Design a protein around this nucleic acid. Structure first.
Ligand SMILES: [Mg+2]
Ligand SMILES: [Mg+2]
Ligand SMILES: [Mg+2]
Ligand SMILES: [Mg+2]
Ligand SMILES: [Mg+2]
Ligand SMILES: [Mg+2]
Ligand SMILES: [Mg+2]
Ligand SMILES: [Mg+2]
Ligand SMILES: [Mg+2]
Ligand SMILES: [Mg+2]
Ligand SMILES: [Mg+2]
Lengths: 31, 107, 62, 63, 50, 50
RNA sequence: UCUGGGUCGGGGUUUCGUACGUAGCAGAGCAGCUCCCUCGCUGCGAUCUAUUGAAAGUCAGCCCUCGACACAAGGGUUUGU
RNA sequence: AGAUCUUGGUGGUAGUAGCAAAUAUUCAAACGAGAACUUUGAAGGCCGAAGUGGAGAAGGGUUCCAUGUGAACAGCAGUUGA
């Protein structure tokens, strides 16, 4: 689930470049 | 105070006039660094990457005449360094530059 | 304070400005600045150039 | 700290050149921990490496 | 001074005051304003002051 | 500097009683302020300050 | 200092020549619609007109501000009959 | 003391000539004591398929690869390197 705090930071990490670049699809860590 | 942030517009055309084609944008970076240097007196000046991109948006020689930046003096008490205050310069997009002062924005 | 002339653009050529030009047919023309000379020699219609007096009168402007 | 071998392995794995290989800048030490193509594939599953899309060469102008 | 080049009475008829910062064609601001009439900046300025 | 239209009173010339446009220069000359007096006495070796 | 000088802005000057958007029974014509219109309406259409001597630049070595901002009685090195 | 003598070493020149052929780099972060030069990301560029791309022949012979080093070399530098 998402709240304002989670989406507000997620916007920053999903964008990995300037306008016209692919958005990040996932960042998952596994052990 | 000492954590103040302000809003500026920079006559890049004024500070670039005369330099060669392939030095216009790097010299623009140097002159915005020296602008922040003489404004906040902070030896440490950091330029946001989005601001650099905004500088180079029209190649190396067609540098924009006017850039609306925003300076922010922050505390460098995060590590042992000789300088305790630094200035971030962040790009502020605007639609026009007419009737723009230097305005004291809050935090 | 001398005799006043009007340019290719119909402007106000104050004494000590611009140039005059002569032609074989006998016509004498005066020009305010080299922009007017270059416009005239290229055979450009003054009534079509936006900023000349003749255009302003043809379009009733002002 | 140094990521040329990992970038080479990622370019060979993804069948794209080193131009189209994106290593996450903030998260570096796990990429440096990768030394084999198997760990590279684990990271490409984990999303820490992304193949970048092709630079567009539009033909609408020509059409 | 004894030559006729000196001992000359000087009586000026006209003094040029056009712009030297480029090809000026107006002597003074009043002549310019009368010549070219109201403009857009003057239009909006007289709009602000009604 | 600028230029001046004026009249000529030069007898025997082609330009007698004819207009001329002549280049002139402007030099701003605000009034002086006298603040001292110095004296010089003539010497065989030159002119020394007394 | 009766402050000062900067940095933006404003005004002047000047250069070029009328910006984007919008409107138009302007527009060579062309493609569709006629319970419809009785001569109409919907698109495509370079170019033109109004908005528009507009837009943009304008000192870095141009002129004047008294508008806004912060900065400035600070550093270092020597010098004696 | 000579032989434009033989061998070796050392001066001025001189911190001088110079390190200018082939368009061009910039920002942030990391590591590290140290960053113009390394790496990663962002940006701007160039080679423009008769390439600065991908593989061979002759020739080189371990230069290939992993890890570590900052002695010397890479005519500046280096955390990098044939
Ligand atoms: Mg001049
Ligand atoms: Mg100004
Ligand atoms: Mg002998
Ligand atoms: Mg010898
Ligand atoms: Mg030298
Ligand atoms: Mg050199
Ligand atoms: Mg290109
Ligand atoms: Mg090219
Ligand atoms: Mg090849
Ligand atoms: Mg070296
Ligand atoms: Mg190797």
């Amino acid at each position: 689930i998402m709240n304002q705090e989670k989406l507000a930071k997620l916007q920053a990490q999903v964008r990995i470049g300037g306008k016209g670049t692919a958005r990040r699809k996932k960042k998952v860590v596994h052990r | 105070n000492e954590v103040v942030t302000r809003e500026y517009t920079i006559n890049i055309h004024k500070r670039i006039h005369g330099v060669g084609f392939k030095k216009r944008a790097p010299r623009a970076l140097k002159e915005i660094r020296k602008f922040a240097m003489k404004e906040m007196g902070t030896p440490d000046v950091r330029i946001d990457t989005r601001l650099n991109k905004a500088v180079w948006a029209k190649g190396i020689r067609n540098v924009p005449y006017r850039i609306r930046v925003r300076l922010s003096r922050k505390r460098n008490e995060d590590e042992d360094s000789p300088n305790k205050l630094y200035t971030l310069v962040t790009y502020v997009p605007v639609t026009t530059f007419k009737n723009l002062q230097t305005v004291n924005v809050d935090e | 304070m001398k005799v006043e002339l009007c340019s290719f653009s119909g402007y106000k050529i104050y004494p000590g400005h611009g140039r005059r030009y002569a032609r074989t047919d006998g016509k004498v023309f005066q020009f305010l600045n080299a922009k007017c000379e270059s416009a005239f020699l290229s055979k450009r219609n003054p009534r079509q150039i936006n900023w000349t007096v003749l255009y302003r009168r043809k379009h009733k402007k002002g | 700290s140094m990521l040329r071998l990992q970038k080479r392995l990622a370019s060979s794995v993804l069948r794209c050149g080193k131009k189209k290989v994106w290593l996450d800048p903030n998260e570096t030490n796990e990429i440096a921990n990768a030394n084999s193509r198997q760990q590279i594939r684990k990271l490409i599953k984990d999303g820490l490496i992304i193949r970048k899309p092709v630079t567009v060469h539009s033909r609408a102008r020509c059409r | 001074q004894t030559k006729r080049r000196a001992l000359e009475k000087i009586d000026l008829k006209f003094i040029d005051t056009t712009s030297k910062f480029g090809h000026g064609r107006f002597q003074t601001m009043e002549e310019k304003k009368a010549f070219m009439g109201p403009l857009k900046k003057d239009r909006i300025a007289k709009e602000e002051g009604a | 500097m600028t230029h001046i239209v004026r009249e000529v009173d030069r007898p025997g010339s082609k330009v007698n009683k004819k207009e001329v446009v002549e280049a002139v220069t402007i030099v701003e000359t605000p009034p002086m302020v006298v603040v001292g007096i110095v004296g010089y006495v003539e010497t065989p070796r030159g002119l020394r300050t007394f």
